[PDB]
Structure formats: structure tokens, C-alpha cells
């Protein structure tokens, strides 16, 4: 329902904390690093830097996605919005 | 790295408002960043004009190029004011 | 006497001078170069530090935390361009809800 | 393993983005992008590490990696 | 009508020539330069470089605009598309 | 003076962009952007000129201006 | 004997060597540096020049014009990334109409 | 500026296909561009690792960083092949 949604926007927009649990993220980084070089170790701050940048990247993406969703007539964001945003952003997989 | 100075500048602007270590981290990133940016363009300007030395005239043009509208005008004023004092203030 | 004081500055003219040559930017950097650059650095520092300090007061605090730098940078239209593709660690995002909601 | 990222977490991330309603599909879609983003960044990050002959990826490596990505990050040095 | 439109797309997509009359463009450049410095003169190639870059910029913009228009349900491109594109592109006036 | 740009020309430019239908308003809207694009580029272009003390803006100036804009152009030097 | 021939290359090793130091990139550039760089330059040149030459034939011509470089660069997915934010003067655009039309 | 070489390379690849002056202009822009790009990163890599000299080891890492996926692998091979010939081919 609309009221809780906005209430959540308001609260999480006022927030400054990392929204993903530290551990799961760290694992994702290790489980990725292993491809490029098997004997790799990341300092905790280096991992931290990645999360700060990762979540920053994502909300920024979300904002743009939101603008696309609204561009039609919707309030609900679909994959096609993330894609249209990333497209115009020049991003690629 | 700049913490000394940025703190010195802080008291000069808000002589009662402190700054966190983490926020100081950011300030340091900012200082190094725009330094890297300005010196990069300055250096670029010098090669284009086949000059082997980076004059203050390059720092200025670099500043005009990288900084926004009116934010750039002050930076030039401040720099000229500063450079001139130093040169005369032997 | 100090090159930083002769130029009436806080930022280290000398340090900036070292960085200019070490950096391998130039072949030889002039005398006024670091003093001008040091000057601009100090200026911009004061600028964002000012707006930041304001936002710190406006909330309720005395210590400036990243959120303030963020809120500060994003709210000044001119500073927002300069640090457009910059991410302030723990800066968070500027409160904003698209009207249509 | 990326499944460790969570519906909540993504919803929060979306909330901070100013998103009101979230289709159930964007949770997996977002995991797609987060992974690609991290791969690209960590790849260049370890390339910088493999340069100083350091087995440990320092925070300055992630920074240079990000600057190469066109994403400057403040707070971990300069 | 659809048939002529596509026929035009096909022809102008195959084309490589500058689509704006040289002269009007050159005037626009002079009439702009005069602000920044009154005693300014542009070499013909410098002007040419500006047009190559200007029209390049514009079709690129148009492509993106088109993607926005289509994003709703439309085929006709409106200002709101150019704006949504420029927004996600990070551009500003 | 920007009115010298023309409905045809913009339609062609749109056509090359793969645009089928064009609302009558985008002609003036496009003039808006083309002007802003040129101002930004010519401003930095003359700043480069005002640096070598040359009253004439060379094609290499427009190039450096464009590179600063994040728009590299091939065909006028390097 | 020639440094370009000793390295089995077409691109001027010497020239590249001059550019590396003049450029004020380094303090001192090593011996293999320009030879490696010259090598990569020649490679990439050959690559895009090859694909370009193909497109020239595919149409009907013998001379490679910008359109070919363009069509070439844009069609190779890998080359398209490298020269992503590059504008080929008189290159035109890659023929393409969004399906939905 | 590179026209000599790029033409020499052209005949080597397509010994019957010519190239326009305007297209040659582009090729020259390309050569200078990626040169500037690669040397820029190489230089960046050297300062980071507090080295006063740009080794071929920097040109290589720079190449890995700037060039796409598999397009980078060849460039490294070609460069190593080339560097090695030159070094041994005294």
C-alpha cells in the first residue's frame, strides 16, 4: 500500500548505512576474485570500498530506472526499465 | 595528508564546528582529486602549446576549463590574489 | 619565511610544488604554479567546508559528518557539477520523491 | 552465492532510490547487474594488484579500478 | 504515412553527408563565438569539425530519444523523450 | 539565428536516428539542445584558443574542446 | 640496423620512443616500452584496417572510405567498446531500425 | 603523420585495397588516440607504484586495462613477441 512505501522511501532516503549484510557481500567478492586470481585476499577496507561503491551505483541506477517506469504510466519498476536506463547510460554486460 | 590544513581552513570558516575522521577522509579525497584534475589539464595545455614548463597561466586556464561557471571566477581571483601577494611579498 | 605565509595561504605551497614535479606532469614547473594551485585548493576546500558546516548546524550537530558534505555538495548546483561523478562514502542520497508519487 | 544479496536489501536500495512499487522480477535482474558491476571492477582491481606484485588487493586498488570505470570514490585515500 | 517514413530512415541511414546547410550553421557558430570573444575567427575546418560533432551528437541523441518514445507505447517522439534521455545521459543545460 | 537550422534537416537527423514519427514540438526543443551543445563546446574551444594567443580557433581547438566534453572526434588530427 | 626492423614491425619504434619521453609521461622510459607500444599500435591498426577493407569489398569498392571504418568498427562488438565514445567523421551511422516499427 | 605506416600495414593486409585521404585522417586520429590512452595509463601505473620509469611491463598492464577482452590478449602477445625479437635481435 502506498502509505508504507513512501514511509520506507522517507526513512531509507534519510539513512546513510549500508543496506546489504556485510558477510554475504564479502563472500560474493571472494567468490568472484577467485576467477581472476586464485591466491587473492582483499583487505577489509578494500571490500568496504567496493560495497560503498556498489550500493551507491545501485541506488543511482534505481533512480534512473524509476524515471523510466514513470515515463510510461507506472509506479512499479520492471526489468525493461533497468534495461532502458542501462542502455541510455551506455552500460553493457 | 591534508587534515592539518583542511582543519585549519575549517576553524577559519566555522570556528566552532568540528569534523569527523571519516568526513576528513572524504575531504582528503576531494583535495587530491581536483589537484589531479587541475594538474592533468594544466599538463595537457602545456604539451599542446609545446611548452616544457607548467606556468601559473596554465593552472588558471585549467581552472577555467574544469570548474563551473562562477565557481571558477572566484578560484581565478583567489589564485591571482594569492600568486601576486607571493611574488611581490618577496 | 614560509611560502604558504608569503602567499597568505593555509594549504602547503611547498607540498603542492613537490607534487607538481614528482607527478611528472611537467618538465619544469614555474614558481607561481604551486602557489596558484594551492590557492584554488584552499578556496574550494573552504567553499564546500562552509556549506557542509551549515548543514551540520541545520540538523542539530557540531561535528561535520559525510552526510553533511553530501547534502552540501548536492544542494549547491555549481558544486554538484564539479563532483558529479563522485561518490561520497557514507554520504547517502539527497532526500527526494518524484512528485507523481 | 549472489543469492546472499536479499529481497529486503534490494527493496531498501530501491527505496533509497525513490522507488515505490517493485515488480518481483527486478530482484533477480538487479543481482545480474550487481554481479557484472563487481566483476568489471574487481577484474581491473586485481590487475592493479598483480602489478605491484601484491597478493592482497588494497583499498587503493579498488579506487583506481573505480576511477577507470568513471566512478570516483571519496573516503579511502586519493 | 508509415511507408515513406521508413523509406526515409533507410535512405538517411545509408547516407554519410551532413544534413544541415553549411552556411546557416557557420552563422550560428559565429553568432555564438561573439559572446566569449568579439575578435574571433574560426577556420573552415574548425567549423566543419563542429558540425561533424554536432550532427553526430544529435542522431545519437535521437536514437536514445526514440528508445524512450517506444518505451511507452509510441512511435512519435516528444520533448519529454529528449528530456528523459538527456536526464539519464547526465546532460544539463 | 538558430532558426536557420531546418525542419527538414532536423527530420533527416531524426531519420538517421531511426525516428519514424516526429511531434511538431521537437523541432524547437532540438534547437535548444543543439545551441547548448555548441555553446559548451565553443566556450572551451575558444578558451584553448585564448591560451596560445591565437585569434583564430583552429580545428585542433574544437578537438580538445570535444575531448574535454567526453566526445573524441577522428578526422581532424589527433 | 633499424629498431623497427629489429622488432619486425612497420610502425616507427623510434618515433614512439620520442613521443613517450617528450610527452612528459615518464621520468625515463625503458628500451622495450616503445617497441611494445609500437607493436600494439600496429596490431590494432591492422585489425580495424582488415575489417574495414572487408566492408569496402562487400559494398563494391577498392578504396576504403570512412563509412567502411565506421561500419567496421561498429560491427565488431569488441572494437565497438574501445571506440565507444569516438565519432568517425563522415562515418555515418550503422543501418538499423527498431523492430517495433 | 602515420600515413606511411598505416599504408604499409594496409598493403600487408589487403594488397589491393586503397584508402582515402579522409579515411587516412581517421586512421591517424585512431593511432594518436589509443597511443595517448595507453601511455596515459602506463604513466598512471608507474606513479602508483612509485617507479620513475615506464617499463614495457607498464605498457602491457595498461593494454590489459584499456583494451577489450580478447582484443587485449592478442595485443599482449604481439607486444611480447615484438619486444622479445628486438631484445634478442641485438
From Swiss-Prot, chains A, E:
Its main location: nucleus. The modification N6-(2-hydroxyisobutyryl)lysine is found at residues 14, 22, 37, 80. It is found in: Nucleus; Chromosome. The modification N6-crotonyllysine is found at residue 14. The modification N6-acetyllysine is found at residues 14, 37, 73, 80. Acetylation is generally linked to gene activation. Acetylation at Lys-80 (H3K122ac) by EP300/p300 plays a central role in chromatin structure: localizes at the surface of the histone octamer and stimulates transcription, possibly by promoting nucleosome instability. The keyword Nucleus applies. One of its GO terms (molecular function) is protein heterodimerization activity. The modification Phosphothreonine is found at residues 38, 65. The modification N6,N6-dimethyllysine is found at residue 37. This is Histone H3.2. It comes from Gallus gallus. The lineage of its organism: Eukaryota, Metazoa, Chordata, Craniata, Vertebrata. The gene is H3-I. The chain holds residues 44 to 136 of 136 of the full protein.
UniProtKB/Swiss-Prot annotation, chains B, H:
Keywords: Acetylation, Antibiotic, Antimicrobial, Chromosome, DNA-binding, Isopeptide bond, Nucleosome core, Nucleus, Phosphoprotein, Ubl conjugation. The nucleosome is a histone octamer containing two molecules each of H2A, H2B, H3 and H4 assembled in one H3-H4 heterotetramer and two H2A-H2B heterodimers. The octamer wraps approximately 147 bp of DNA. Belongs to the histone H2B family. GO terms for cellular component: nucleosome; nucleus. Coiled coil: none annotated. It comes from Gallus gallus. This is Histone H2B 1/2/3/4/6. One of its GO terms (biological process) is defense response to bacterium. The gene is H2B-I.
From Swiss-Prot, chains C, G:
It is found in: Nucleus; Chromosome. Its main location: nucleus. The modification N5-methylglutamine is found at residue 90. The modification N6-glutaryllysine is found at residues 81, 85. The modification N6-(2-hydroxyisobutyryl)lysine is found at residues 22, 60-61, 81. One of its GO terms (biological process) is heterochromatin formation. GO terms for molecular function: DNA binding; protein heterodimerization activity; structural constituent of chromatin. The keyword GTP-binding does not apply. Following DNA double-strand breaks (DSBs), it is ubiquitinated through 'Lys-63' linkage of ubiquitin moieties, leading to the recruitment of repair proteins to sites of DNA damage. H2AK119Ub and ionizing radiation-induced 'Lys-63'-linked ubiquitination are distinct events. The modification N6-succinyllysine is found at residue 81. Keywords: Acetylation, Chromosome, DNA-binding, Hydroxylation, Isopeptide bond, Methylation, Nucleosome core, Nucleus, Phosphoprotein, Ubl conjugation. There is a cross-link at residue 1 (Glycyl lysine isopeptide (Lys-Gly) (interchain with G-Cter in ubiquitin)). GO terms for cellular component: nucleosome; nucleus. The keyword tRNA-binding does not apply. Signal peptide: none annotated. Core component of nucleosome. Nucleosomes wrap and compact DNA into chromatin, limiting DNA accessibility to the cellular machineries which require DNA as a template. Histones thereby play a central role in transcription regulation, DNA repair, DNA replication and chromosomal stability. DNA accessibility is regulated via a complex set of post-translational modifications of histones, also called histone code, and nucleosome remodeling. Belongs to the histone H2A family. This is Histone H2A-IV.
Swiss-Prot record, chains D, F:
The modification N6-butyryllysine is found at residues 7, 20, 53, 55, 67. The modification Phosphotyrosine is found at residues 27, 64. The keyword Plastid does not apply. One of its GO terms (biological process) is nucleosome assembly. GO terms for cellular component: nucleoplasm; nucleosome. Keywords: Acetylation, Chromosome, Citrullination, DNA-binding, Hydroxylation, Isopeptide bond, Methylation, Nucleosome core, Nucleus, Phosphoprotein, Ubl conjugation. One of its GO terms (molecular function) is protein heterodimerization activity. Demethylation is performed by JMJD6. Monomethylation is performed by KMT5A/SET8. Trimethylation is performed by KMT5B and KMT5C and induces gene silencing. The modification Phosphoserine is found at residue 23. The keyword DNA-binding applies. This is Histone H4. The gene is H4-I. The chain holds residues 26 to 103 of 103 of the full protein.
